[PDB]
Design an enzyme around this catalytic site. Structure first.
Site, mmCIF file in Angstrom:
data_model
loop_
_atom_site.group_PDB
_atom_site.id
_atom_site.type_symbol
_atom_site.label_atom_id
_atom_site.label_comp_id
_atom_site.label_asym_id
_atom_site.label_seq_id
_atom_site.Cartn_x
_atom_site.Cartn_y
_atom_site.Cartn_z
ATOM 1 N N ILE C 12 0.837 -1.183 0.000
ATOM 2 C CA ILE C 12 0.000 0.000 0.000
ATOM 3 C C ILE C 12 0.877 1.240 0.000
ATOM 4 O O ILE C 12 0.638 2.190 -0.753
ATOM 5 C CB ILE C 12 -0.933 0.004 1.234
ATOM 6 C CG1 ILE C 12 -1.852 -1.218 1.177
ATOM 7 C CG2 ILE C 12 -1.766 1.256 1.274
ATOM 8 C CD1 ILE C 12 -2.518 -1.389 -0.168
ATOM 9 N N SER C 139 -10.155 -1.040 5.560
ATOM 10 C CA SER C 139 -9.499 -2.086 4.784
ATOM 11 C C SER C 139 -9.913 -2.218 3.332
ATOM 12 O O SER C 139 -10.936 -1.671 2.909
ATOM 13 C CB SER C 139 -9.665 -3.441 5.482
ATOM 14 O OG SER C 139 -10.991 -3.921 5.347
ATOM 15 N N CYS C 140 -9.106 -2.949 2.564
ATOM 16 C CA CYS C 140 -9.398 -3.133 1.152
ATOM 17 C C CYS C 140 -10.803 -3.705 0.989
ATOM 18 O O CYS C 140 -11.563 -3.246 0.140
ATOM 19 C CB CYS C 140 -8.373 -4.071 0.518
ATOM 20 S SG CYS C 140 -8.175 -5.586 1.503
ATOM 21 N N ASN C 141 -11.154 -4.707 1.798
ATOM 22 C CA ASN C 141 -12.490 -5.297 1.685
ATOM 23 C C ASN C 141 -13.584 -4.399 2.233
ATOM 24 O O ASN C 141 -14.680 -4.327 1.666
ATOM 25 C CB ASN C 141 -12.574 -6.668 2.379
ATOM 26 C CG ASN C 141 -12.002 -7.771 1.526
ATOM 27 O OD1 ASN C 141 -12.202 -7.798 0.304
ATOM 28 N ND2 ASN C 141 -11.287 -8.690 2.155
ATOM 29 N N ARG C 166 -8.211 -13.550 -0.915
ATOM 30 C CA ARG C 166 -6.942 -14.055 -1.446
ATOM 31 C C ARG C 166 -6.043 -14.361 -0.236
ATOM 32 O O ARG C 166 -6.106 -13.658 0.778
ATOM 33 C CB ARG C 166 -6.258 -13.037 -2.399
ATOM 34 C CG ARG C 166 -6.122 -11.556 -1.960
ATOM 35 C CD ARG C 166 -4.654 -11.072 -1.688
ATOM 36 N NE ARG C 166 -4.303 -11.411 -0.332
ATOM 37 C CZ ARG C 166 -4.072 -10.559 0.660
ATOM 38 N NH1 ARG C 166 -4.109 -9.244 0.498
ATOM 39 N NH2 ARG C 166 -3.873 -11.058 1.861
ATOM 40 N N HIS C 191 -15.183 -7.344 9.203
ATOM 41 C CA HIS C 191 -15.696 -6.506 8.129
ATOM 42 C C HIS C 191 -17.000 -5.775 8.440
ATOM 43 O O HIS C 191 -17.112 -4.590 8.164
ATOM 44 C CB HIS C 191 -15.850 -7.347 6.857
ATOM 45 C CG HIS C 191 -14.579 -8.015 6.435
ATOM 46 N ND1 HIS C 191 -13.597 -7.360 5.724
ATOM 47 C CD2 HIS C 191 -14.081 -9.239 6.721
ATOM 48 C CE1 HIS C 191 -12.547 -8.151 5.596
ATOM 49 N NE2 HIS C 191 -12.813 -9.296 6.195
ATOM 50 N N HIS C 216 -9.933 -10.248 -3.965
ATOM 51 C CA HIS C 216 -10.921 -10.849 -3.076
ATOM 52 C C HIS C 216 -12.261 -10.852 -3.832
ATOM 53 O O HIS C 216 -12.448 -10.094 -4.811
ATOM 54 C CB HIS C 216 -11.121 -10.002 -1.807
ATOM 55 C CG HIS C 216 -9.874 -9.750 -1.023
ATOM 56 N ND1 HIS C 216 -9.130 -10.764 -0.461
ATOM 57 C CD2 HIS C 216 -9.296 -8.591 -0.619
ATOM 58 C CE1 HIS C 216 -8.155 -10.243 0.263
ATOM 59 N NE2 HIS C 216 -8.234 -8.926 0.185
ATOM 60 N N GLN C 297 -7.302 -5.867 -3.856
ATOM 61 C CA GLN C 297 -6.800 -5.469 -2.556
ATOM 62 C C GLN C 297 -5.496 -4.683 -2.549
ATOM 63 O O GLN C 297 -5.206 -3.997 -1.566
ATOM 64 C CB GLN C 297 -6.653 -6.710 -1.661
ATOM 65 C CG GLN C 297 -5.405 -7.560 -1.918
ATOM 66 C CD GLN C 297 -5.458 -8.369 -3.212
ATOM 67 O OE1 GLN C 297 -6.527 -8.533 -3.806
ATOM 68 N NE2 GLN C 297 -4.313 -8.866 -3.653
HETATM 69 N N1 LIG Z 1 -3.923 -6.255 0.365
HETATM 70 C C1 LIG Z 1 -3.167 -5.508 1.165
HETATM 71 O O1 LIG Z 1 -1.844 -5.766 1.349
HETATM 72 C C2 LIG Z 1 -3.870 -4.341 1.857
HETATM 73 C C3 LIG Z 1 -5.099 -3.878 1.393
HETATM 74 C C4 LIG Z 1 -5.758 -2.832 2.030
HETATM 75 C C5 LIG Z 1 -5.197 -2.239 3.152
HETATM 76 N N2 LIG Z 1 -3.975 -2.724 3.603
HETATM 77 C C6 LIG Z 1 -3.421 -2.158 4.834
HETATM 78 O O2 LIG Z 1 -2.162 -1.548 4.612
HETATM 79 C C7 LIG Z 1 -1.543 -1.451 5.899
HETATM 80 C C8 LIG Z 1 -0.170 -1.943 5.428
HETATM 81 O O3 LIG Z 1 -0.318 -3.005 4.466
HETATM 82 P P1 LIG Z 1 0.740 -3.409 3.309
HETATM 83 O O4 LIG Z 1 -0.034 -4.298 2.412
HETATM 84 O O5 LIG Z 1 1.335 -2.190 2.720
HETATM 85 O O6 LIG Z 1 1.844 -4.293 4.081
HETATM 86 P P2 LIG Z 1 3.279 -4.582 3.435
HETATM 87 O O7 LIG Z 1 3.858 -5.631 4.292
HETATM 88 O O8 LIG Z 1 3.162 -4.841 1.989
HETATM 89 O O9 LIG Z 1 4.050 -3.203 3.656
HETATM 90 C C9 LIG Z 1 4.298 -2.751 4.974
HETATM 91 C C10 LIG Z 1 5.524 -1.840 4.924
HETATM 92 O O10 LIG Z 1 5.851 -1.491 6.283
HETATM 93 C C11 LIG Z 1 7.217 -1.894 6.511
HETATM 94 N N3 LIG Z 1 7.482 -2.154 7.944
HETATM 95 C C12 LIG Z 1 7.613 -3.109 8.870
HETATM 96 N N4 LIG Z 1 7.807 -2.596 10.093
HETATM 97 C C13 LIG Z 1 7.805 -1.280 9.917
HETATM 98 C C14 LIG Z 1 7.954 -0.160 10.712
HETATM 99 N N5 LIG Z 1 8.171 -0.270 12.022
HETATM 100 N N6 LIG Z 1 7.878 1.028 10.091
HETATM 101 C C15 LIG Z 1 7.683 1.221 8.798
HETATM 102 N N7 LIG Z 1 7.557 0.184 8.003
HETATM 103 C C16 LIG Z 1 7.614 -1.013 8.583
HETATM 104 C C17 LIG Z 1 7.474 -3.089 5.589
HETATM 105 O O11 LIG Z 1 8.883 -3.186 5.383
HETATM 106 C C18 LIG Z 1 6.787 -2.500 4.358
HETATM 107 O O12 LIG Z 1 7.627 -1.510 3.756
HETATM 108 C C19 LIG Z 1 -2.187 -2.502 6.815
HETATM 109 O O13 LIG Z 1 -2.862 -1.951 7.945
HETATM 110 C C20 LIG Z 1 -3.180 -3.212 5.901
HETATM 111 O O14 LIG Z 1 -4.412 -3.550 6.544
HETATM 112 C C21 LIG Z 1 -3.290 -3.759 2.975
#
Ligand SMILES: NC(=O)c1ccc[n+]([C@@H]2O[C@H](COP(=O)([O-])OP(=O)(O)OC[C@H]3O[C@@H](n4cnc5c(N)ncnc54)[C@H](O)[C@@H]3O)[C@@H](O)[C@H]2O)c1
Ligand SMILES: NC(=O)c1ccc[n+]([C@@H]2O[C@H](COP(=O)([O-])OP(=O)(O)OC[C@H]3O[C@@H](n4cnc5c(N)ncnc54)[C@H](O)[C@@H]3O)[C@@H](O)[C@H]2O)c1
Ligand SMILES: NC(=O)c1ccc[n+]([C@@H]2O[C@H](COP(=O)([O-])OP(=O)(O)OC[C@H]3O[C@@H](n4cnc5c(N)ncnc54)[C@H](O)[C@@H]3O)[C@@H](O)[C@H]2O)c1
Ligand SMILES: NC(=O)c1ccc[n+]([C@@H]2O[C@H](COP(=O)([O-])OP(=O)(O)OC[C@H]3O[C@@H](n4cnc5c(N)ncnc54)[C@H](O)[C@@H]3O)[C@@H](O)[C@H]2O)c1
Lengths: 334, 333, 333, 332
Positions: C12, C139-141, C166, C191, C216, C297
């Site tokens: 994200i 969230s995405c969903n 997924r 959700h 999803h 997502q």
């Molecule tokens: N499908 C998805 O992946 C998706 C969809 C919708 C919302 N989100 C939301 O996005 C938020 C993050 O998701 P994501 O998919 O980007 O996860 P990700 O694992 O792809 O990315 C997370 C990032 O944070 C980093 N990280 C770990 N510890 C850290 C810290 N202390 N500080 C900064 N970075 C740190 C990781 O290295 C990475 O760069 C979550 O709350 C999740 O619910 C994710």
């Protein structure tokens, strides 16, 4: 009397070995260990197998659920002649001193370093090497598969190159990827080659990969021949090598799925295919090189190997007497 | 002894054939194959005579020197009833043949309700097949839905269930999707009317296919007409035949561990004849009941096939047949 | 221009960073990375100042000769707001750090609702975040549920949705299940309540995880409280932003083809920002509406974060921001 | 400007059409389709004229309100060459139509060697196609093998490679195996002789199919005739066009991350036209070199078709074409 066996680590390999031990008339399963009272622990008890907490440290997990145990591994070690260590790779090494202090023999699985035991083992290849030994390492699932067929033709092999196409996780493991990718082992060669050499003397190099499947591993084998050998000679040899079976893609054996279906058809416990599968049509000879493809059911190919290792370590029987006995008890017509 | 034959020794056919050999009031006469693949050789090794499905396929067996006991026409002469386990849609095509032969026939869930005089699920409407000549055992999914819904039908005012189905059986390696979710756009789904051919209940379903081969999963919502508590549902399901409660808290995290339970039992082909219900998923919110169940599609219909035979030949009463079949297959409750 | 920074250059994180880059009223001051992997090098290549997420991470960088523009503490000094994109649960632990720095912060859907002043989905409650300091983009969903549900809210008396999720994102190869369906035994699913933090509606949801990485899928059922027809719904969806209708009859059989449409558009990272709804799936039976939608997502919360920024700094009206964000991302309608 | 027509707007077909519209010495006259599905519409939206692949298919576009520019015959009359991207085996079938129309024609890797005058891989045997009327660009797997082997050809007297293929492309959802490894029991497999159709070398291959859609992976072993170091091989690859080295240490654990590299590039369809080679996999043991590479089968042969057109129409010298094609697609 029967050799008293204990199994530390009632996991995918452990529970299958425990079952194998119960099928031997010269061995008795004293008990197995678990780190938590999950459904597998309940199953062991349901089977009448004494369940011991792997350690005093896990006892609270059992007490919490009100799951009574017969004790801890320390208790179990006082009542067995040998412990089959079926814990996660690396954990065997940590347990070894506990076994030496308790004065009991021990068998470690392929996930441990050769370091761990006095000798690595594959019954049909070096049974006698484990005679009387106290610490034996049954090599890994892929190493065992490689040794079974390579050992049968070692005399004709000058050099062998094998590619390991490995499953990503066992059917019961749902917490491991990759869902959609091929993960290569960049280290060349993989651990398989030298591991093979701890059992039989042979010039070998291997490379490995992980793909998204759970069924079996598959081996792409290439051998440079340093002595005459035909296609029929090879199928003849494999046709007569124990714990090895030829499968014909022509009969409908298209992939590892149908190979496993053969085991399901036999109504095997856990659909175990103890035998290494070799695709008959894949055996070919071009120039002075032999090629063939085999498959390994990683959840159970090392099961018979653990039983025989026990017989060699206690000098209960000669090589073929043990292998045949082990084979009959597991339904391996070989 | 009721003489039985199986036309179509595939996923369902081979498991039903095995079930027959475990019934002492029955006799497996033979099974059919369209070619001498490893499954035909297995049948032969088991001592089960194998007939060529049709006169047409004969040369396939001859080519390989595979001796057959004859063809389906020969088989039909030797049985009181034929269990048809051919691909969906092919059973109807075989019906005329069965009719002429004068043999009773059982079709599987892939056929339209059209094909038989009644659809069947032993614990739900066993009596409806008593003495019939043509009965169809409903699909793996319909059977699962029926078993648990029937147990609580008196409290059900309306039902909405989502079918999350496996994309292909484990021995089926020529079917996708490898990486996708395929929705059935026909809404409501056909699972609901199929359930209504066995029990009277207001139901609507929707289905999807995902990349798994182990078990289907159902998400069920039931609008209650009468008060019902979580414990009430648990007690009912625990006293419902061919249904089992699994606790996520004991390690049953997904369909893989559910199947692991059947593998631990050393079940033939790892068959889980019983419908699996996650105990913790059973929840009551307002006037609604929610629960999640899983169905091992390769085998949940085989015990239904054996009871259908007993009803059609009026060999025994409902619970007597069910009890007997369960014992033969190791189903505890 | 609003000074924006993103802590967590992940799935994200990097997509929101790119989105910020496309806004003429915002400026990306920097992104944070815990290690000098190929994604850190990418950010550097794109000219994005790269900051070490923490002090205790600088060594990894130094060891690789990767010059960082400082740490998170340094970045916070140069921004008006930071988009927190760290794993669920880490955001809450970062809030105190942001409050101390005195900067506004946006959290993702993996954080609890209480982590911010309000939860947010632009087209639903843009206004609710006007001038706020801490906002949680759901969230995405949840976002996919809100976009479509918000458009028919007035007719919805009750909604039951099943999330078929997924297992892991395409770039995530360390997570299972390879072959199984894993249910969330907790009812309701997280959700339902998260949707309720954005729009007032009666809803209960259940979720499952399956072996796919693409998108999803949602099985939606809506109990109506006002007259509504299928035709009405199609028309309503044809007219709600960030939602697109796909026809199975044109070849959209599954999520693979939905994603194929995004690939065909040459979308960055094959981003399908908009919620996909199978047109043929929309149907009303009696007093209930049914439809099936899919969520990419990896990108559907992207445009929401951008609009969140404008509302928080009161940069424009609801629809001016949305249209402005849409145009910047190629968002169709 | 050479007039190009693409027959078979499929995975390879639609990507090659795009490549050509990106060229300055050529113009896409039109593409063909069998049905008016969503891809047919997309082509129309792009302003690309869509022809029904055959008259017998016209009704399909008629039942729908999809207007087409004609049939394959109407397209054949407006082009100098047609890129055939039909399913393997159909290319041979379509050849007699291309001949009776007197237009050059390129077939893809799925066709047999005899369908063309010469098999082709630009950077290895560009000159071989100069002026020819019929050329088959080799398959995704063979292209990958050729690009890297060709680069060390002078040091290899023997090559053995194992093909670990993806079961279905991302957009193909009706093909298994969902959970299994399917071997090619014919060994050596057809990959070796296919390579021998482009470069002269002693090679033998074996193939397998696994449950993945992203990329194929090749396990390669090379028997050395002349000494060669790991640094030697790495330098050769760094200097070989349409080949990129990836470091597992930088996070490239598998084909998924490799693909992720292409997505970060915002590459169309996440196309990774270049063959990927894991730097750490390159090792020499005895008189043997070992390395692992991955091929994005959906896009790897794309640049190859564009270069084949120039060679066939003698529009440019080997490297000038390759530099130009590379440029148009952003290869580097
Ligand atoms: N499908 C998805 O992946 C998706 C969809 C919708 C919302 N989100 C939301 O996005 C938020 C993050 O998701 P994501 O998919 O980007 O996860 P990700 O694992 O792809 O990315 C997370 C990032 O944070 C980093 N990280 C770990 N510890 C850290 C810290 N202390 N500080 C900064 N970075 C740190 C990781 O290295 C990475 O760069 C979550 O709350 C999740 O619910 C994710
Ligand atoms: N297919 C395979 O998984 C396979 C094949 C061949 C050989 N082996 C070998 O068998 C050994 C274990 O493999 P596995 O797949 O059965 O592992 P597993 O994960 O299935 O189970 C191993 C057991 O270790 C137990 N455990 C964890 N910590 C423990 C401790 N401190 N003490 C005792 N038990 C503990 C766990 O409860 C578990 O039951 C390894 O050396 C492995 O290489 C595994
Ligand atoms: N999970 C399941 O596969 C499942 C579950 C419940 C019910 N059913 C139903 O059972 C029936 C068959 O399912 P299946 O899984 O056994 O299919 P299958 O394809 O796995 O096996 C069917 C068999 O039918 C045989 N066959 C094909 N053509 C034949 C012919 N002309 N004459 C005789 N035999 C022929 C084939 O040789 C094959 O052995 C269908 O109605 C299906 O819907 C299947
Ligand atoms: N990764 C790949 O998909 C790949 C890789 C390397 C080489 N190739 C080769 O390219 C060719 C096609 O591959 P693809 O993956 O693009 O196939 P494709 O399935 O994606 O589709 C091929 C196309 O042919 C059209 N087609 C079918 N019948 C036709 C007809 N009668 N006339 C005209 N067109 C017809 C089809 O609708 C479709 O658009 C094959 O030879 C294949 O081996 C494919």
């Amino acid at each position: 009397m029967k050799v008293k066996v204990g199994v530390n680590g009632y996991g995918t390999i452990g529970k299958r070995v425990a079952y194998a031990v119960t099928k031997q008339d010269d061995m008795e399963l004293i008990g197995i260990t678990k780190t938590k009272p999950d459904f597998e622990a309940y199953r062991a008890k349901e089977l009448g197998i004494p369940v011991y907490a792997a350690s005093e440290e896990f006892i609270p997990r059992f007490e919490k659920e009100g799951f009574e145990v017969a004790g801890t591994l320390n208790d179990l070690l006082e009542k067995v002649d040998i412990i089959v260590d079926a814990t996660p790779g690396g954990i065997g090494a940590k347990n070894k001193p506990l076994y030496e202090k308790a004065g009991v023999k021990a068998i470690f699985q392929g996930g441990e370093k050769a370091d761990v035991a006095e000798v690595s083992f594959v019954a049909q290849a070096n049974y006698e090497a484990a005679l009387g030994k106290n610490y034996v390492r049954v090599v890994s699932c892929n190493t065992t598969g490689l040794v079974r067929t390579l050992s049968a033709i070692r005399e004709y092999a000058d050099y062998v190159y094998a590619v390991m196409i490995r499953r990503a996780a066992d059917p019961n493991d749902t917490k491991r990827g990759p869902i959609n990718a091929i993960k290569p082992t960049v280290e060349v060669p993989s651990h398989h080659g030298p591991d093979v050499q701890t059992v039989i003397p042979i010039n070998i190099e291997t490379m490995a990969f992980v793909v998204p499947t759970t069924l079996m591993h598959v081996h792409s084998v290439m051998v440079e021949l340093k002595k005459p050998l035909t296609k029929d000679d090879v199928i003849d040899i494999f046709e007569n090598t124990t714990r090895v079976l030829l499968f014909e893609k022509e009969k409908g054996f298209d992939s590892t799925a149908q190979i496993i279906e053969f085991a399901r058809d036999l109504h095997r416990e856990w659909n175990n295919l103890y035998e290494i599968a070799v695709w008959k049509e894949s055996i070919n000879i071009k120039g002075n090189r032999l090629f063939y493809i085999q498959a390994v059911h990683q959840e159970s190919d090392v099961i018979p190997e653990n039983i025989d290792a026990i017989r060699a370590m206690f000098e209960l029987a000669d090589k073929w007497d043990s292998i045949k006995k082990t084979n009959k008890s597991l339904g391996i017509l070989k």
